[PDB]
Amino acid sequence: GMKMLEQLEKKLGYTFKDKSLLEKALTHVSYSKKEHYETLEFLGDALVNFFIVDLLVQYSPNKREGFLSPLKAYLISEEFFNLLAQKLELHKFIRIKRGKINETIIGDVFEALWAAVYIDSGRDANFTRELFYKLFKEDILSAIKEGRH
Amino acid sequence: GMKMLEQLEKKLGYTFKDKSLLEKALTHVSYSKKEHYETLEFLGDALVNFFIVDLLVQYSPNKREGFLSPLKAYLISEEFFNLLAQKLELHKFIRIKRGKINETIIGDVFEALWAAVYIDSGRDANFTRELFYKLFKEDILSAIKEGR
Ligand SMILES: [Mg+2]
Ligand SMILES: [Mg+2]
C-alpha cells in the first residue's frame, strides 16, 4: 500500500536531515548526471573499509596480518557487500536507467549509502560506525568463524 | 610516560591512558615477538586511509574519482606518510633490535600509532580524526593543490 521511494531509513534506523543526500547515494549516473553517488562511494569505500577491519582486528581468533588479509578481502568484496545490501533491499531504492543495474552498482551504492549517512550525521564516525554494526555486526563475525576466502 | 614516551605524547598532543598501548605501536617484532606493532598497523592502515580520504572528499576542488585517486595514491604513499611522521620525530621512539629503522617501518609505525590512539581513546574515531587534522590537515591541504 505504501513505501516505494523510501522505507530504507526505517531499515537503517536513521532519518536523514538532508533527503537529497540519501537520494544522491542511491542515484546512478544514467539516472542523474548532476548528482549521483560517485563521490559518495569514494568516501564510502574507505569509510566502510575501516568499519570492517576494526571488527576484524577485534574478533578474529588470530591477529597476524597473514591470516587477516585473505579474510579482509572477502568482507570487503562487492559480493559480500551484496549480502549486506540484500538486508537493505537496496536494489529497490536504486535510481537507475535502463534494465542493467548489476552487482557492481549495488555494493557501490552500499558504499555511497554509508558515506551519505556519515556526512548526514555531521561527520559522526562513531555513531555511523555503530549504526553499521547494529545491522551487520552479527553477520561479519559469523563470516569470521567460518573463515571464507 | 617513562623517560622518553612523555615527549612523543607532547608532540602528538595526546597522552595515553594505556602506556603499553602506545609502546606496542612503537615496537618492532625484532624487539618483542610477543607484543609488536603488526596488528595495530593493520587497523591504522584502514584508519589512516579513512581520515585522509575524508579530507580528500571534502577539500578537493575536483570531485570526479578520476581526479581523486591519484592524489590519494600519494597521500597514502609511504613517502608522504614519512613526511608526516617527521613532524613527531617518530624514528626516535621506535623500538628495534638487530637492525635499523627504515621509511617503510616508520610508515608502518605511523599507522600503528593512530590505531593505538583510536583504541586508547575508547575507539573514538571523531577525536582521533581531529587530532590527525590538528597535526596534519595543513600539509594535506597544501599537498592536494599539487604541492610537490
Ligand atoms: Mg566500490
Ligand atoms: Mg603498513
Coordinates of C-alpha atoms and ligand atoms in Angstrom, one line a residue:
Chain A
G1 CA 0.0 0.0 0.0
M2 CA 2.8 2.4 0.9
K3 CA 6.6 2.7 0.9
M4 CA 8.3 2.7 -2.5
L5 CA 10.5 5.7 -2.8
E6 CA 11.7 5.1 0.8
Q7 CA 11.4 3.0 3.9
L8 CA 15.2 2.4 3.8
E9 CA 15.6 4.9 6.6
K10 CA 13.5 2.5 8.7
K11 CA 15.8 -0.3 7.8
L12 CA 19.0 1.7 8.6
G13 CA 17.4 3.1 11.8
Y14 CA 18.3 6.6 10.6
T15 CA 16.3 9.5 9.4
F16 CA 18.3 11.9 7.2
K17 CA 18.3 15.6 7.8
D18 CA 19.0 16.2 4.1
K19 CA 17.0 13.8 2.0
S20 CA 18.9 14.7 -1.2
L21 CA 22.0 13.2 0.5
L22 CA 20.3 9.8 0.7
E23 CA 18.9 10.2 -2.7
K24 CA 22.3 11.1 -4.3
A25 CA 23.9 7.9 -2.8
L26 CA 21.1 5.8 -4.4
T27 CA 21.4 7.6 -7.8
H28 CA 23.5 6.1 -10.6
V29 CA 24.9 8.3 -13.4
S30 CA 22.4 7.1 -16.0
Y31 CA 19.6 8.4 -13.9
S32 CA 21.2 11.6 -12.9
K33 CA 24.4 13.4 -14.1
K34 CA 24.1 16.4 -11.8
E35 CA 24.2 14.5 -8.6
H36 CA 24.9 10.7 -8.5
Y37 CA 26.7 8.6 -5.8
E38 CA 30.2 8.6 -7.4
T39 CA 31.8 11.0 -4.9
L40 CA 29.9 9.4 -2.0
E41 CA 31.1 5.9 -2.9
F42 CA 34.7 7.0 -3.0
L43 CA 34.3 8.1 0.6
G44 CA 32.2 5.1 1.5
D45 CA 34.9 2.8 0.1
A46 CA 37.4 3.8 2.8
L47 CA 34.8 4.6 5.5
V48 CA 33.3 1.1 5.4
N49 CA 36.8 -0.4 5.0
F50 CA 37.6 0.9 8.5
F51 CA 34.3 -0.4 10.0
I52 CA 35.2 -3.9 8.9
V53 CA 38.9 -4.2 9.7
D54 CA 38.2 -2.6 13.1
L55 CA 36.0 -5.6 13.7
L56 CA 38.4 -8.0 12.1
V57 CA 41.3 -7.0 14.4
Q58 CA 39.0 -7.4 17.4
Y59 CA 37.2 -10.7 16.8
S60 CA 39.4 -12.8 14.5
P61 CA 40.9 -15.7 16.5
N62 CA 44.3 -14.9 15.0
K63 CA 45.9 -11.4 15.0
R64 CA 48.7 -11.9 12.4
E65 CA 48.4 -9.9 9.1
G66 CA 48.8 -13.2 7.1
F67 CA 45.5 -14.6 8.5
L68 CA 43.7 -11.3 8.4
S69 CA 44.3 -10.2 4.8
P70 CA 42.6 -13.0 2.9
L71 CA 39.7 -12.7 5.4
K72 CA 39.7 -8.9 4.9
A73 CA 39.5 -9.2 1.2
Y74 CA 36.3 -11.2 1.5
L75 CA 34.4 -9.0 4.0
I76 CA 35.0 -6.0 1.7
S77 CA 34.1 -7.6 -1.7
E78 CA 31.1 -6.4 -3.7
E79 CA 29.8 -10.0 -3.4
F80 CA 29.7 -9.8 0.4
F81 CA 28.6 -6.2 0.2
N82 CA 25.6 -7.5 -1.8
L83 CA 24.6 -9.9 1.0
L84 CA 24.7 -6.9 3.3
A85 CA 22.7 -4.8 0.9
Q86 CA 20.1 -7.5 0.4
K87 CA 19.3 -7.0 4.1
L88 CA 18.5 -3.4 3.0
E89 CA 16.6 -4.4 -0.1
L90 CA 19.0 -1.8 -1.7
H91 CA 18.2 -2.7 -5.3
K92 CA 14.7 -1.5 -4.6
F93 CA 15.7 2.1 -3.9
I94 CA 18.5 2.5 -6.5
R95 CA 17.5 5.0 -9.2
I96 CA 19.0 3.6 -12.4
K97 CA 18.1 4.0 -16.1
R98 CA 17.5 1.0 -18.4
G99 CA 17.4 -2.5 -17.2
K100 CA 21.1 -3.1 -16.5
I101 CA 21.8 -2.4 -12.8
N102 CA 24.3 -5.1 -11.8
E103 CA 26.3 -6.3 -8.8
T104 CA 28.9 -3.5 -9.3
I105 CA 26.5 -0.6 -8.8
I106 CA 24.9 -2.3 -5.7
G107 CA 28.0 -2.7 -3.5
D108 CA 29.0 0.8 -4.7
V109 CA 25.6 2.1 -3.7
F110 CA 26.1 0.1 -0.5
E111 CA 29.3 2.1 -0.3
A112 CA 27.8 5.5 -1.1
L113 CA 25.0 4.8 1.3
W114 CA 27.1 4.7 4.5
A115 CA 29.1 7.7 3.4
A116 CA 25.9 9.7 3.0
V117 CA 24.8 8.6 6.5
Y118 CA 28.3 9.6 7.7
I119 CA 28.0 13.1 6.2
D120 CA 24.4 13.5 7.2
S121 CA 25.3 12.7 10.8
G122 CA 27.6 15.7 10.9
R123 CA 30.7 13.5 10.3
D124 CA 29.9 11.2 13.2
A125 CA 32.2 8.3 12.6
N126 CA 31.4 6.5 15.9
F127 CA 27.6 6.8 15.5
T128 CA 27.7 5.8 11.9
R129 CA 30.1 3.0 12.8
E130 CA 27.7 1.8 15.5
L131 CA 24.7 2.1 13.1
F132 CA 26.6 -0.2 10.8
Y133 CA 27.2 -2.7 13.5
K134 CA 23.6 -3.0 14.7
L135 CA 22.8 -4.2 11.2
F136 CA 25.7 -6.4 10.2
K137 CA 28.0 -6.9 13.2
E138 CA 26.3 -10.3 13.6
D139 CA 27.0 -11.4 10.0
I140 CA 30.6 -10.2 9.9
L141 CA 31.7 -12.2 12.9
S142 CA 29.9 -15.3 11.6
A143 CA 31.9 -14.9 8.4
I144 CA 35.0 -14.6 10.7
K145 CA 34.4 -18.0 12.3
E146 CA 33.8 -20.0 9.1
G147 CA 36.8 -18.3 7.6
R148 CA 35.9 -17.5 3.9
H149 CA 38.5 -16.8 1.2
Chain B
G1 CA 55.3 8.0 30.2
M2 CA 58.8 6.7 31.1
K3 CA 61.9 8.7 30.3
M4 CA 61.0 9.1 26.6
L5 CA 57.4 8.3 25.9
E6 CA 56.3 11.5 27.6
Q7 CA 57.8 13.6 24.8
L8 CA 56.2 11.6 22.0
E9 CA 52.9 12.5 23.6
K10 CA 53.5 16.2 23.9
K11 CA 54.3 16.4 20.2
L12 CA 51.4 14.1 19.4
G13 CA 49.3 16.3 21.6
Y14 CA 47.8 13.3 23.2
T15 CA 48.6 11.5 26.5
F16 CA 47.6 7.8 26.7
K17 CA 45.7 6.1 29.5
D18 CA 47.3 2.9 28.5
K19 CA 51.1 3.3 28.4
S20 CA 51.9 -0.2 26.9
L21 CA 49.3 0.5 24.2
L22 CA 51.5 3.3 22.8
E23 CA 54.6 1.3 23.3
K24 CA 53.3 -1.7 21.3
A25 CA 52.7 0.6 18.4
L26 CA 56.3 1.8 18.6
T27 CA 57.7 -1.8 19.0
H28 CA 59.2 -3.8 16.2
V29 CA 58.7 -7.6 16.4
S30 CA 62.5 -7.8 16.5
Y31 CA 62.3 -6.2 20.0
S32 CA 59.3 -8.2 21.2
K33 CA 57.9 -11.1 19.3
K34 CA 55.0 -11.1 21.7
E35 CA 53.8 -7.5 21.6
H36 CA 54.7 -5.7 18.4
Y37 CA 53.0 -3.1 16.1
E38 CA 51.9 -5.6 13.5
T39 CA 48.2 -5.7 14.4
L40 CA 47.8 -2.1 15.2
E41 CA 49.4 -1.4 11.9
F42 CA 46.6 -3.4 10.4
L43 CA 43.9 -1.2 12.0
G44 CA 45.7 2.2 11.5
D45 CA 46.1 1.4 7.8
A46 CA 42.3 1.4 7.3
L47 CA 42.0 4.2 9.9
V48 CA 44.5 6.5 8.3
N49 CA 43.2 5.8 4.9
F50 CA 39.8 6.9 6.2
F51 CA 40.9 10.2 7.7
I52 CA 42.7 11.2 4.6
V53 CA 40.1 10.3 2.1
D54 CA 37.6 12.2 4.2
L55 CA 39.8 15.3 3.8
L56 CA 40.2 14.5 0.1
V57 CA 36.5 14.2 -0.4
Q58 CA 35.9 17.4 1.4
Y59 CA 38.6 19.8 0.1
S60 CA 39.3 18.5 -3.4
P61 CA 38.2 21.2 -5.9
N62 CA 37.5 18.4 -8.4
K63 CA 35.2 15.6 -7.2
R64 CA 35.5 13.2 -10.2
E65 CA 37.0 10.0 -8.8
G66 CA 39.4 10.0 -11.8
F67 CA 40.8 13.2 -10.2
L68 CA 40.7 11.8 -6.6
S69 CA 42.5 8.5 -6.9
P70 CA 45.9 10.0 -7.9
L71 CA 46.5 12.5 -5.1
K72 CA 45.1 9.8 -2.9
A73 CA 47.7 7.4 -4.1
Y74 CA 50.3 9.9 -3.0
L75 CA 48.6 10.9 0.3
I76 CA 48.8 7.2 1.4
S77 CA 52.3 6.8 -0.1
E78 CA 55.0 5.7 2.4
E79 CA 56.8 8.7 1.1
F80 CA 54.1 11.1 2.3
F81 CA 53.5 9.1 5.5
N82 CA 57.2 9.7 6.2
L83 CA 56.6 13.5 5.6
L84 CA 54.0 13.4 8.4
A85 CA 55.9 11.1 10.6
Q86 CA 58.8 13.6 10.6
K87 CA 56.5 16.0 12.5
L88 CA 56.9 13.9 15.6
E89 CA 60.4 12.5 15.0
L90 CA 59.0 9.0 15.2
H91 CA 62.2 7.2 14.4
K92 CA 63.4 8.4 17.8
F93 CA 60.8 6.4 19.7
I94 CA 60.7 3.2 17.6
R95 CA 61.8 0.1 19.4
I96 CA 64.0 -2.2 17.4
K97 CA 66.7 -4.8 17.9
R98 CA 69.2 -6.3 15.5
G99 CA 68.9 -3.9 12.6
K100 CA 68.0 -0.4 11.5
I101 CA 64.9 1.8 11.1
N102 CA 63.5 2.3 7.6
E103 CA 61.0 4.6 6.0
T104 CA 58.7 1.6 5.4
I105 CA 59.0 0.7 9.1
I106 CA 58.4 4.3 10.0
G107 CA 55.3 4.3 7.8
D108 CA 54.1 1.1 9.5
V109 CA 54.5 2.6 12.9
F110 CA 52.8 5.8 11.8
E111 CA 49.8 3.6 11.0
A112 CA 50.2 1.7 14.3
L113 CA 50.3 4.9 16.4
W114 CA 46.9 6.2 15.2
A115 CA 45.2 2.8 15.7
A116 CA 46.6 2.9 19.2
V117 CA 45.4 6.5 19.7
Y118 CA 42.0 5.4 18.3
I119 CA 41.8 2.4 20.7
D120 CA 43.2 4.1 23.8
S121 CA 40.7 6.9 23.4
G122 CA 37.8 4.5 23.6
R123 CA 37.7 3.7 19.9
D124 CA 36.8 7.4 19.3
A125 CA 37.1 8.0 15.6
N126 CA 36.0 11.6 15.8
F127 CA 38.5 12.7 18.4
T128 CA 41.3 10.8 16.7
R129 CA 40.4 12.2 13.3
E130 CA 40.6 15.8 14.8
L131 CA 43.9 15.1 16.5
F132 CA 45.1 14.0 13.0
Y133 CA 43.8 17.2 11.4
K134 CA 45.3 19.4 14.1
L135 CA 48.7 17.9 13.2
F136 CA 48.5 17.2 9.5
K137 CA 45.5 18.8 7.9
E138 CA 47.5 21.8 6.8
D139 CA 50.2 19.7 5.0
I140 CA 47.5 17.6 3.3
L141 CA 45.8 20.8 2.0
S142 CA 48.9 22.4 0.7
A143 CA 49.6 18.9 -0.8
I144 CA 46.3 18.4 -2.5
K145 CA 46.9 21.5 -4.6
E146 CA 49.9 19.7 -6.2
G147 CA 52.3 20.9 -3.6
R148 CA 55.3 19.0 -4.9
Ligands
MG1 MG 33.3 0.2 -4.7
MG2 MG 51.6 -0.6 6.5

